[PDB]
Amino acid sequence: GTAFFQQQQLPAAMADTFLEHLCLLDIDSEPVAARSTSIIATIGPASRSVERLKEMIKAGMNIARLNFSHGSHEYHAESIANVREAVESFAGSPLSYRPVAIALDTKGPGSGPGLSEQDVRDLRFGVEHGVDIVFASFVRKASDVAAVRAALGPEGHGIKIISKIENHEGVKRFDEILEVSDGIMVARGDLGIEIPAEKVFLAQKMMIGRCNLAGKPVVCATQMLESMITKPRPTRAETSDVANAVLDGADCIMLSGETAKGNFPVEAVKMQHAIAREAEAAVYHRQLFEELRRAAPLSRDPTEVTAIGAVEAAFKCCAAAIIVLTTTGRSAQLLSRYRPRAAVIAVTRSAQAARQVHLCRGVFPLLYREPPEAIWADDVDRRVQFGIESGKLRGFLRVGDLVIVVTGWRPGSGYTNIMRVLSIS
Amino acid sequence: ELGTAFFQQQQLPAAMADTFLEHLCLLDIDSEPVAARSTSIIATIGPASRSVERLKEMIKAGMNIARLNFSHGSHEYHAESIANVREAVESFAGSPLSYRPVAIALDTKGPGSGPGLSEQDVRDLRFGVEHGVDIVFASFVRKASDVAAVRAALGPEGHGIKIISKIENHEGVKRFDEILEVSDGIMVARGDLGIEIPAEKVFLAQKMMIGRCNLAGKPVVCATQMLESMITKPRPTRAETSDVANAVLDGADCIMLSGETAKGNFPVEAVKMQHAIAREAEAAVYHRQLFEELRRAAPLSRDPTEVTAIGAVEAAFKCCAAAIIVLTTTGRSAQLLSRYRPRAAVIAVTRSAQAARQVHLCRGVFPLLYREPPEAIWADDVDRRVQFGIESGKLRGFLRVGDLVIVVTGWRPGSGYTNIMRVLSIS
Amino acid sequence: RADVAQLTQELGTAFFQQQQLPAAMADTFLEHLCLLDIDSEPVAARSTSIIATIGPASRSVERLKEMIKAGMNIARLNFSHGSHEYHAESIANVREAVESFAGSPLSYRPVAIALDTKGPGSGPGLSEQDVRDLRFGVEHGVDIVFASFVRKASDVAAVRAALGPEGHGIKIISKIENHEGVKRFDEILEVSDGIMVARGDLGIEIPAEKVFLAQKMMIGRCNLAGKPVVCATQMLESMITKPRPTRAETSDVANAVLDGADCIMLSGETAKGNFPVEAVKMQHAIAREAEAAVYHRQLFEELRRAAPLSRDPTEVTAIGAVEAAFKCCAAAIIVLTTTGRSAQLLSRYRPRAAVIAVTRSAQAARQVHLCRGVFPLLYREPPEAIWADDVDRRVQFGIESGKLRGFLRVGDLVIVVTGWRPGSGYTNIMRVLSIS
Amino acid sequence: AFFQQQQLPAAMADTFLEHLCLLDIDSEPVAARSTSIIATIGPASRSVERLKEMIKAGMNIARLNFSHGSHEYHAESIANVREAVESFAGSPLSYRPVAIALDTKGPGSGPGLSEQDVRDLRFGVEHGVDIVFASFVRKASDVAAVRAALGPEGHGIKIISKIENHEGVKRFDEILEVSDGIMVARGDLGIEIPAEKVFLAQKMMIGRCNLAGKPVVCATQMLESMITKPRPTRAETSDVANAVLDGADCIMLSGETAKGNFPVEAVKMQHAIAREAEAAVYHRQLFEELRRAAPLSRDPTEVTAIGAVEAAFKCCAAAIIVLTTTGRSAQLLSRYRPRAAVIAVTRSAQAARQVHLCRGVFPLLYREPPEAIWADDVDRRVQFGIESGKLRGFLRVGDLVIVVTGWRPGSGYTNIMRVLSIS
Ligand SMILES: CN(C)c1ccc(S(=O)(=O)N2CCN(S(=O)(=O)c3ccc(O)c(O)c3)CC2)c2nonc12
Ligand SMILES: CN(C)c1ccc(S(=O)(=O)N2CCN(S(=O)(=O)c3ccc(O)c(O)c3)CC2)c2nonc12
Ligand SMILES: O=P(O)(O)OC[C@H]1O[C@](O)(COP(=O)(O)O)[C@@H](O)[C@@H]1O
Ligand SMILES: O=P(O)(O)OC[C@H]1O[C@](O)(COP(=O)(O)O)[C@@H](O)[C@@H]1O
Ligand SMILES: O=P(O)(O)OC[C@H]1O[C@](O)(COP(=O)(O)O)[C@@H](O)[C@@H]1O
Ligand SMILES: O=P(O)(O)OC[C@H]1O[C@](O)(COP(=O)(O)O)[C@@H](O)[C@@H]1O
Ligand SMILES: O=C([O-])C(=O)[O-]
Ligand SMILES: O=C([O-])C(=O)[O-]
Ligand SMILES: O=C([O-])C(=O)[O-]
Ligand SMILES: O=C([O-])C(=O)[O-]
Ligand SMILES: [K+]
Ligand SMILES: [K+]
């Protein structure tokens, strides 16, 4: 229908140049796709109550950040318990349950050369409390990431380490840091004090670009909606900043004081949700997909090969979604690196993977709770139907839509190799 | 994992270039072709190429389609030619490394002075149906109704025969779109075309028709005087080798030999020359731009076969896949893969002898006729044909242990349900 | 590398490390982003003009001199506040600060004066106060009118009529502040000299989360049309009270420049804030960084692909001159202009080279600040008897002022754009000159 | 009607595939033929009357094959060419200069320059030849030996290196660096390397020469069958069209004109095909790729050339009129493959003959009286290019032209591009 092609900036998406794409952007072309950039909300006195946390989950919070620069272990354990209580209050409806990751943001090295003794204690607390992600403060070199990894020990091998780049050395040694990290956070607060303020946008754009090229999550952080700490509406520079972080290629956008101590924590989440949805429809996928395809090296890994074939197939038919079965989240991450317009619905039995895939733009995790079927092919089909039923309930899919389904040839992580075109009935 | 030698062969330095100009600059006469020859060779059967022994040599040299020119000879003469082709083809049933299907094409005499289908073309088309020909090269197609007349003449039994319309005059060129729409493919019949329009304009008609056929995903044949001097000489001129290479680089699915094989002194050598040039020219194709342009020009599709095909070709390029193995009954799944011009060979596994012969019209499709009895469990039968394609691939040199192959199948039996693409590691 | 090797040996590796030149040579936009370097220092003069709103914090002659030195190019008078007497005093103080630097072209900086109207209010068209204020603008020789709440072409015809026969030279920049203005954008741009994305009202008239779409669409259409576009409101809002902006504010200024804005504006930051000079310095610092980060390879190709073929020799010369400037990494394009139009056509192709515009019109020298990358030089030397000698003298004046100001160096290549006969509209010549 | 001719619908296409789809056999070529025709002079084309017909048919360069015939035979050929060329000097606005190229016998089994090549090269200098087609060039030192044998009097002669064997192809870059241009000598090349690989060598060499901005000639068996038949084969017309589409500056005729029964018809056939093939060139991609690949430059002639070609495409300029002493300014314009004709106005007779090596350069030998004021003299040569262009069909009143001149007399000072309206 004609109406389909008038929505989600589809006239601007069909443009032959980026300049023409900009000219065709329409404030009346409503976004239809689900919001794909994750919202990280920092937990504090304004967002700690179980009832307030339920409102924030409904508004769109995907990751709960615990800032270990403030508060004791007792304070953070209570925050964790309140987050988990608010998250599990929706578990009664498995088709609409939304997993929420828990990220521990470290205090940092301070004047010392490497890992502080408080960071070692806080990291062990994170492992003991089952945190999903570590936002490692002031990472300056690859050995800083290795020290964080060693402090997590053998039980914390599954925790994702997102390195915070906050100073000149971190920016200069970026490639070596990204190589050993699971992702990056552009920590603009400290970065804007360590380097000239007028240069922070160059560091942000460079880091987002390099993370997109590497296929690793990148978080844009600090003062995105600062004025909303005390005011109900953000400034014109703030909405522009959020939209441009998404247009730059950020996987995640963050709220610090806006949710930790502000008067509008839920409204700050709703604002980031609204801007991100508008900005994602304004992404010029024609150039972005071509450039990601061109920049990506040849690969003999079947997951990587299946992912690009599936994204190409999704664009060919305007698939509403790519439904992927994943154990670690990796198959969903490799799909996400090609920035499909289709939602990546990731069906998993791992509660930790369902939480961690929020780091990857466009990945919508579904936690499947049923015990495995005796016949593995039936177990596989049941999970794909779970992804379809949740997708229909949430508005991702309708009858008549085409979906791309991504599976593997045997159970266990690392064997994704199949892509199939499916019609929604 | 593959080695530096792998990336020096088959013009891979030129293939990785960022511009077409740089691609040309990187072409290397020392970069040897490794991939199997993907552009089919059509050889016209005549007095110089009719004997069963000569036909065996032509099959070994690379002939994929045997052309019977109904402008010369009687039905009895052509039936004997057909029987000799089939005898030469079946002489390799004892060697899997050599049994290759060969299509039989009937080239019509034409309408002559008359308006539509001639009495003789009607009788000759009937002969083709009765003798089980795979393809009709319809002479002097001028409009869509000419194709409908040929199609109507393919009686109740011959609706599966492919109609390749020969464009040989100004009207055929001008009404090209309407002709291509109702035809299975096109032949740029340069002999008559070069007499009907100014000779210096034929290259424009050839390039335009090949481009439109590539955009439509329909077979296009480049024909006439490609290696003309080889009718009396053992080596072609510099213009002739250039012409064969440029037909492949233009986007032709097939290249043809007429007098060179029908009446010449070197029919086998003419086939060998076309084989050698096509292999070199296929490695020199600038896939980076070709794939992007085919992708961009092709419209969005809700047909799972079309969606699977582009996903599979994208996957093949990503891993330098040795091959795309496709299960096909009509050949359609192999044809949709072929339209995206993959560098990987498209190994088409079919139980249909006719589809095996007819897929020679599509560039890069290597048919394998499968004759094992069907399995009770369908998924087992699918696995069996996939493994058959892998093992013939290994036997013929297409594949080795450790290679990656893309596999295209459907979710249920019967034609029309292709929707699956898998990445398999060769064990 | 081979496409920049001889010039790398000639100019040196240090030349190609500065002004984001490694990012500028990238083959894709993604690679361009990856190559952005915080240590790659900007070298070129700031090309995006800064409009500063004059008010109690920025009205004194001494403060205005500091703002001109900080980088203010256009002084905005907001007619929503203050009397005609108040604005006439503001104008006189701006002119006094401007003329305090008039001893030489090396120190002189023309500053345009823009009148921002109160607006229609609840009424359908031009208010009686707007008619009076527009007549005040003509009488006080304002260069630009920022017309508030333009909703259709007839609104700009009414502003043009209220300016009368004496105000035909005044540039009308239409402020788009509501849904109707955005929807009827093409008809408004057609009859306007330029556009202002007035984000303050726009953010209240349409959903706040959609303002960035309106800004990017309007900047893109203005760039395609070759008309000035101003990005306005809350760019450095926090600097009204604080000496440093927030991370969203520096990002907003940089992104307005990267979007393609010709001008960036300061309202409360300079009119009533505690740090008006620091707000100007911050915009100057960010614009210089953002201009070097522009991906000229794609921008120039897209401006060429989107622009229709032209039989206007000024338009043909402009693209040839910009192409020539990119081929040799020209330090400047020196153009002779009566109305500013030849400099504007050069500016639409977004050259990396500075466009030094030599003119005798004081008004054109002020108004060309609306065009990104145009540096106006007001020529006051006595005329030559022979027209060809007079042209050559103005070209040499451009080169001398360029050299003494740091824009040009001995050894540089400069592109010179002139016409074949006197009078506006005859530009048709492009010359490649080596600086000695 | 303007946009229906010269494949302009195909020229406006957004992809090369769409460009091919839009090629129209009814879209007539209107631009003058840009690719020069080199015709080999022999028994079938030696008479002054025959040579006049070949000049009218389109011959731009006369090739003397020193593998056959004596010095007396070649001197007579040269004199007959010059007599046929000067028979048209009565109409200066339509006079066509014709270059004379000497094709050497070659080294044979020898390591360097043979004694016959030294004698033949000295003959060329003494008879004022414009170009040397140096046979079997295998390395840069082979070009240096040819250059030394030409001596101080043969400084101005262009050396076009013939690549005819494996070594020449492998050492191509070093050969091109010291040569004025290249000839893809397909006859010997097709015997020295496998025949099925010659097209790879041709396309690589044409591409590298286009990148370097140096003339490249496609040679041998282009219309071979026309030695005995009045019409060529379908492979032959395709070969001529593809050499032009590949980017060749010149196309050659050997036996077709030297000994064949239809030398004039062979020239007419190459002219007709080249005109059709030049209109089918996809300039949108070609200009962008040549523009992207041409390195950054601080040479004002180079900078003016790109500005002028960009300006010509922006206004659909009928021509770029350039003033040149050595031909260099016209060559730098030619390397960007403008659709506009490059009308090169020169006082040098040798430069007018030699610029035939550069595709799209139409030489005008200026023989009008000088003007006292240099500025007036320049403007007069510009009007001469405009009137010659008007007479020859190139230009009409109302057209736009780009004019490329310098700031002072003498070679090497081009730095000005101007947009001029015709009449
Ligand atoms: C995530 N990441 C790598 C990307 C972001 C945005 C894009 S994008 O949104 O497609 N876009 C961005 C800006 N331009 S531009 O060349 O600077 C230009 C061109 C014309 C103008 O008028 C203008 O103001 C600026 C490049 C393309 C991408 N494409 O590929 N990758 C893209
Ligand atoms: C199969 N069939 C449809 C096609 C053939 C070749 C190609 S192609 O190989 O990608 N194609 C070759 C011709 N050039 S060009 O513009 O003539 C050019 C440009 C720059 C130069 O320096 C030059 O000498 C020539 C465009 C690129 C195709 N692409 O899409 N479809 C293609
Ligand atoms: O993305 P990951 O972590 O590699 O997991 C993908 C895996 O999920 C599957 O699709 C299903 O596996 P399970 O039955 O063990 O859940 C596997 O075939 C595949 O290897
Ligand atoms: O190319 P075609 O004619 O559509 O055939 C493709 C068909 O082949 C298959 O892959 C295998 O089917 P069969 O077992 O019936 O041969 C189908 O699942 C698919 O529909
Ligand atoms: O940019 P504008 O307004 O068209 O003015 C450009 C004009 O300036 C000139 O270069 C010099 O003209 P003047 O001598 O009148 O100042 C003209 O040749 C040209 O037409
Ligand atoms: O192309 P070339 O050999 O460098 O010659 C270009 C030269 O021609 C001119 O335009 C005219 O010079 P002359 O008056 O000597 O003929 C010079 O200004 C310029 O330097
Ligand atoms: O730590 C942070 O998030 C910062 O400094 O921006
Ligand atoms: O019939 C043919 O093949 C022809 O005419 O070229
Ligand atoms: O009027 C203004 O400048 C605005 O609303 O931004
Ligand atoms: O000498 C030649 O021209 C050849 O060998 O082709
Ligand atoms: K912290
Ligand atoms: K026939």
Ligand SMILES: [K+]
């Ligand atoms: K106002």
Ligand SMILES: [K+]
């Ligand atoms: K010779």
Ligand SMILES: [Mg+2]
């Ligand atoms: Mg910090």
Ligand SMILES: [Mg+2]
């Ligand atoms: Mg025929």
Ligand SMILES: [Mg+2]
């Ligand atoms: Mg307002």
Ligand SMILES: [Mg+2]
């Ligand atoms: Mg030879």
